[PDB]
Design a protein around this ligand. Sequence first.
Ligand SMILES: Nc1ncnc2c1ncn2[C@@H]1O[C@H](C[S@+](CC[C@H]([NH3+])C(=O)[O-])CC(=O)[O-])[C@@H](O)[C@H]1O
Length: 333
Amino acid sequence: MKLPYKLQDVYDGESQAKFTVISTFAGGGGSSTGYRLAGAKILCINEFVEEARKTYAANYPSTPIVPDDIKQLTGGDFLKITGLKPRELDILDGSPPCVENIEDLFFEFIRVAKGIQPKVIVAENVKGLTIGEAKTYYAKITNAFEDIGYLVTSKVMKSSHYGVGQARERLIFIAVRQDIADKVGLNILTVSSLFPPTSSEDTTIGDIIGGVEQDPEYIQSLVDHMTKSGIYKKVVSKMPKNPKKILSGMDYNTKRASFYKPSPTLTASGGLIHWNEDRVLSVPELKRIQSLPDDFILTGSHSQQTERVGRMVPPLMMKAIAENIYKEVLSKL
Ligand SMILES: Nc1ncnc2c1ncn2[C@@H]1O[C@H](C[S@+](CC[C@H]([NH3+])C(=O)[O-])CC(=O)[O-])[C@@H](O)[C@H]1O
């Protein structure tokens, strides 16, 4: 897909209804958006933050929303909600967030997937890990998917290889029910073919940012709030404009984006500096960098909107993932 696009293209793709998806940890719906673009019928979502639901519902008013804490839910609950039998769901989606006990919602996700028995699981993992925990933890995740009867593969994907002007790198698991994997012929040596081919060679901000609608008064107010603030006086005022590379505020975290590089990763805290203007990036720019449609509705305060975009999987990368799963697995059934 090419940027920009609008919600109506998402609805058009969704109207194909070529495979079924449940999106857990649905957020504002970055993942859902990409599934819908690839032809998915979103059967329902799970999302327990009120403002994420308000944003999701504003863009996708038809999609049923389960508001519960995932810890209170079973796969059978989802099956009952959507009218499905086990094994019937095509894709279960999730991006769980994040001595004393610390909850791990990724393992809550696995527990729910055990009840649903989806044909395919797509799960991004963003657990912050100590040294000496990371590799052992991903091995525990892999074993856990195999325990519930799945062939599983994993890879760090960089969204700028799939048309998104952002260097967002996150580990994504794809797992296929052993049943389905056998029918389609997937094995340990072909399983990595579930990850989509790379379409670009590091899409930059410049490649995708052209033509964003944006009121100069709103943009000016961003510059004004910036210029009269501490991080400007101490850091940003010392950062060159139009950099040829991402700049770190510690060489002068606060980072300055470059027009000629993929964007710095958008995060929930959202502190990225525009490449040209002494101000943070705007919500319209963040939407475009995230590869959302231009008319995507975000609710709440400026800070809540930046957070909601920051926590997303870029729709266009998830579109690539969903297309590839449909061609390589679901279209053979
Ligand atoms: N216990 C819970 N129960 C239900 N929902 C929860 C729970 N805990 C956190 N959440 C919610 O799961 C989402 C995780 S973000 C999803 C972005 C999506 N992939 C997107 O493309 O927009 C990614 C991240 O924050 O790491 C948030 O919206 C939380 O409110």
